Design a protein around this ligand. Structure first.
Ligand code: HEM
Length: 79
């Protein structure tokens, strides 16, 4: 299908093509990378993976809503 399955998500695992799962929502962070105040590599480390725990422990609850636009919010993981 090429939808938001874990299999498909895992393929977006480079700086050039970087998806990250946070609370079962897929974000395309490729263009956000140079904009990230925590640097590119911290996110690239989690490219194609779930970053929920590390995100929750490193950021205030208000960050997601203040830094991202709808164009990078791809949707929920398909189980
Ligand atoms: C989901 C999209 C994300 C947004 C909008 C975002 C935003 C930010 C912002 C605004 C800061 C500076 C304020 C702060 O210290 O919290 C920051 C710092 C940081 N972020 Fe991100 N972040 C995102 C994803 C991630 C991911 C996936 C990681 C990897 C675990 C990460 C790791 C870090 C680290 C290590 C810092 C430095 C913390 C410090 O020096 O106090 N972030 N993030």
């Amino acid at each position: 299908p090429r939808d938001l399955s874990l299999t498909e998500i895992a393929k977006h695992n480079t700086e050039e093509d970087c998806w990250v799962i946070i609370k079962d929502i897929v974000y395309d962070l490729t263009k956000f990378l140079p904009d990230h105040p925590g640097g590119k590599k911290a996110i690239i480390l989690f490219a194609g993976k779930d970053a929920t725990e590390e995100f929750d422990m490193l950021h205030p609850p208000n960050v997601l809503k203040k830094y991202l636009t709808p164009e990078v919010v791809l949707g929920p993981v398909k189980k």
